[PDB]
Amino acid sequence: MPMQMFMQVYDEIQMFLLEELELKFDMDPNRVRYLRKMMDTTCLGGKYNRGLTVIDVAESLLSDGARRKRVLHDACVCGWMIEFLQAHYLVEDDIMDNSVTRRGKPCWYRHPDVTVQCAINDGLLLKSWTHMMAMHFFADRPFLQDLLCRFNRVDYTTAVGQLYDVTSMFDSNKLDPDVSQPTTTDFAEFTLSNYKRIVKYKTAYYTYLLPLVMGLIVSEALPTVDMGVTEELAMLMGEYFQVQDDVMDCFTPPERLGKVGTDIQDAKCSWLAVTFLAKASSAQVAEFKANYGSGDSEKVATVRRLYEEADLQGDYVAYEAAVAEQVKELIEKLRLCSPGFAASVETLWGKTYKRQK
Amino acid sequence: MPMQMFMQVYDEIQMFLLEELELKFDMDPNRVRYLRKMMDTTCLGGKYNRGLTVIDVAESLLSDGARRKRVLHDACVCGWMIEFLQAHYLVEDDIMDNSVTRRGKPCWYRHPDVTVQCAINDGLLLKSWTHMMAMHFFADRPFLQDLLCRFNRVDYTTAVGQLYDVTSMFDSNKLDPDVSQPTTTDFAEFTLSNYKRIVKYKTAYYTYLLPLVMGLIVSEALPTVDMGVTEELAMLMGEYFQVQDDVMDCFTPPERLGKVGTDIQDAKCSWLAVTFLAKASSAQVAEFKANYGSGDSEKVATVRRLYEEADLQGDYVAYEAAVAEQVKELIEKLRLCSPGFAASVETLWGKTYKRQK
Numbered sequence: 001m002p003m004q005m006f007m008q009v010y011d012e013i014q015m016f017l018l019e020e021l022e023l024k025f026d027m028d029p030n031r032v033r034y035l036r037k038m039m040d041t042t043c044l045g046g047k048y049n050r051g052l053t054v055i056d057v058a059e060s061l062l063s064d065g066a067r068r069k070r071v072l073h074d075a076c077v078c079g080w081m082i083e084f085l086q087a088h089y090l091v092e093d094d095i096m097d098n099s100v101t102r103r104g105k106p107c108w109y110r111h112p113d114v115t116v117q118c119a120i121n122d123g124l125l126l127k128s129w130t131h132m133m134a135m136h137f138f139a140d141r142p143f144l145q146d147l148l149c150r151f152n153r154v155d156y157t158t159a160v161g162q163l164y165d166v167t168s169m170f171d172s173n174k175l176d177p178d179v180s181q182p183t184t185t186d187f188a189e190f191t192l193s194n195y196k197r198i199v200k201y202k203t204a205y206y207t208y209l210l211p212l213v214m215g216l217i218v219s220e221a222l223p224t225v226d227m228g229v230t231e232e233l234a235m236l237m238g239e240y241f242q243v244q245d246d247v248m249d250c251f252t253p254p255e256r257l258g259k260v261g262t263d264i265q266d267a268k269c270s271w272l273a274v275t276f277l278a279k280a281s282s283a284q285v286a287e288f289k290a291n292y293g294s295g296d297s298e299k300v301a302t303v304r305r306l307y308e309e310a311d312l313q314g315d316y317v318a319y320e321a322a323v324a325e326q327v328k329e330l331i332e333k334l335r336l337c338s339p340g341f342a343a344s345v346e347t348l349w350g351k352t353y354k355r356q357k
Numbered sequence: 358m359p360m361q362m363f364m365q366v367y368d369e370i371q372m373f374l375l376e377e378l379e380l381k382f383d384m385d386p387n388r389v390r391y392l393r394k395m396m397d398t399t400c401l402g403g404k405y406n407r408g409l410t411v412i413d414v415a416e417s418l419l420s421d422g423a424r425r426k427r428v429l430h431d432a433c434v435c436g437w438m439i440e441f442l443q444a445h446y447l448v449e450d451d452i453m454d455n456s457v458t459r460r461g462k463p464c465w466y467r468h469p470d471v472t473v474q475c476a477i478n479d480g481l482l483l484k485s486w487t488h489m490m491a492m493h494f495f496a497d498r499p500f501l502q503d504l505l506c507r508f509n510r511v512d513y514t515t516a517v518g519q520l521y522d523v524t525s526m527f528d529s530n531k532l533d534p535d536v537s538q539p540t541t542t543d544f545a546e547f548t549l550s551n552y553k554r555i556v557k558y559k560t561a562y563y564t565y566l567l568p569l570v571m572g573l574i575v576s577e578a579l580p581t582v583d584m585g586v587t588e589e590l591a592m593l594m595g596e597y598f599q600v601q602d603d604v605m606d607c608f609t610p611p612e613r614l615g616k617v618g619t620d621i622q623d624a625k626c627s628w629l630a631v632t633f634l635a636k637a638s639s640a641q642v643a644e645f646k647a648n649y650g651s652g653d654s655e656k657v658a659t660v661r662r663l664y665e666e667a668d669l670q671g672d673y674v675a676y677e678a679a680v681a682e683q684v685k686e687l688i689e690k691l692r693l694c695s696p697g698f699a700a701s702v703e704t705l706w707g708k709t710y711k712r713q714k
């Protein structure tokens with residue numbers, strides 16, 4: 001069931017936005033057709049984890065089926081706010097990460113009839129739509145203000161996180177707009193500390209905290225949960241998820257994943273890189289520095305091999321297990337006063353722990 | 358005087374954002390200092406006509422000196438919201454328009470130490486700072502919701518206008534993501550009707566309507582004015598402003614302007630091009646078609662010559678006159694019920710009409 005009504009609302013939403021364009025922005029049917037394809041391609045075909053989580057939270061907490069309908073519909077709308085938000089990021093990220101492929105098909109910027117400049121802007125329409133749907137559907141809702149603030153906070157934080165990511169390979173001390181600079185040769189910034197920061201901000205907020213929050217908001221239950229504990233859950237779960245993403249980038253075949261990995265080529269401060277650099281021999285570190293941040297497939301393979309040789313699958317297992325127990329305890333801390341919420345967090349973790357995506 | 362306080366508030370705003378980044382986002386000094394440079398370079402050095410308008414509306418409309426202080430400070434914050442919004446759009450426009458230079462210096466994405474990926478994200482940071490500064494300064498402010506909503510609406514409209522601009526040279530009939538397509542060779546879409554659509558949406562709203570409205574809101578005076586007339590003015594003054602932009606792109610020396618024109622090279626649907634094409638001989642038109650949308654300087658120079666030869670300067674003078682008096686009529690309608698507001702609108706017409714910039 002969750003999915004049936006979700007897609008039901010996708011169509012309401014989509015209809016509202018396109019019709020609004022035609023009626024109020026003087027839009028010709030070609031561009032309207034174009035933007036429909038852009039919407040479907042950029043927003044559909046994922047697993048909808050963030051949007052579904054919102055609904056799930058709404059459901060779990062509603063422990064006069066008219067309220068039920070209102071809460072569930074709102075939850076769906078928030079659900080798509082996040083998915084459209086996600087979509088926006090992904091459109092821009094792929095350009096920034098110079099990716100080729102996404103969800104089994106070419107990156108939006110790589111579609112044959114999509115110029116790079118139009119993709120950038122298509123990415124922005126996407127973000128605007130999150131506001132547009134919110135304003136329409138929640139016009140007369142006493143929570144729209146708070147909703148919108150929180151949502152802008154997360155978005156900002158995500159943007160900030162992306163700065164961390166996109167500059168993780170330059171020596172921060174030499175980071176000056178006026179002066180050109182090459183990629184770091186010493187990698188002194190590839191530390192777990194910096195890794196954790198990138199990920200907390202680029203991924204944990206919008207992927208884990210935000211959907212929990214929006215589910216609570218549409219259900220008028222925000223004050224009923226330990227937020228400090230809710231926030232730790234999200235920070236932990238989101239870090240692990242990003243770490244999973246980093247591993248898959250490297251070691252999962254693109255056909256399962258939907259996308260070809262660029263973290264090595266782009267010289268990303270991935271979990272692998274940082275965990276590798278902290279335990280590795282000088283000899284290994286040296287071979288790494290010699291092969292990292294390069295298009296060349298042999299170099300890419302070498303980096304992959306160093307990772308295998310340094311037994312990073314060792315470290316991952318241990319990290320994972322360590323995440324799982326902290327998560328288990330915090331869920332129980334939350335179950336004391338918040339049982340319904342706590343169950344949906346458990347489901348969310350269910351979808352994370354050992355995901356094969 | 359207005360300018361004295363506007364820059365005090367800039368510091369205030371800047372000091373708040375950067376400190377937040379430090380205290381709440383775990384930001385290191387290097388990135389902090391990068392972000393300060395980015396902020397200054399993208400938000401300063403222009404003329405601030407959008408920002409200053411807001412204050413002037415505020416000041417006009419005032420008709421215990423503490424409300425005055427509150428309303429004025431609020432107006433500066435609003436003024437910077439639009440200037441930061443403008444800042445965002447320009448970072449992204451310059452990339453999309455492939456421009457070289459802006460406000461006397463290289464485009465942000467062209468700064469030696471700014472990568473393209475990072476500029477795109479810096480533009481997004483700029484946008485989010487409009488929300489954040491609002492959230493902060495207006496937290497206890499009954500109008501914050503109305504403001505954010507109106508602001509988002511306009512922002513979205515600008516994005517829609519930008520799509521009109523960026524696709525204006527493709528046969529819209531063939532516009533499909535899945536299939537590549539070269540520049541239109543027939544230019545059927547280079548009509549004044551389509552031109553008017555581009556410009557209404559990409560420039561008029563944020564540049565003219567939005568400063569006026571913001572001034573009204575913080576003055577708590579929105580309902581005192583004929584909004585349908587206000588909008589008429591803004592659309593008019595906005596179209597004419599963009600017509601002026603298009604012309605200078607072509608015939609103003611880069612040094613007076615602070616930027617190099619790209620409209621010819623980008624094959625943009627500028628006012629000149631529509632105006633030329635509707636009146637030129639078939640021969641002239643063939644020539645234009647041979648030379649438009651190419652970086653080659655001789656081809657670029659030919660086009661310039663075609664525009665001069667077609668006496669577009671007669672068409673401009675006429676348009677200006679018609680606009681000028683159509684505006685004058687509408688101001689007087691407005692002066693009737695709201696003479697304080699109407700004055701600030703005339704001040705604003707005063708900074709547009711015959712601008713050299």
Ligand SMILES: [Mg+2]
Nearest residue numbers: 093096097165
């Ligand atoms: Mg990335």
Ligand SMILES: [Mg+2]
Nearest residue numbers: 093094097099
């Ligand atoms: Mg990526």
Ligand SMILES: [Mg+2]
Nearest residue numbers: 245246249263
């Ligand atoms: Mg990845």
Ligand SMILES: [Mg+2]
Nearest residue numbers: 450453454522
């Ligand atoms: Mg443009």
Ligand SMILES: [Mg+2]
Nearest residue numbers: 450451454456
């Ligand atoms: Mg431009």
Ligand SMILES: [Mg+2]
Nearest residue numbers: 602603606620
């Ligand atoms: Mg221009």
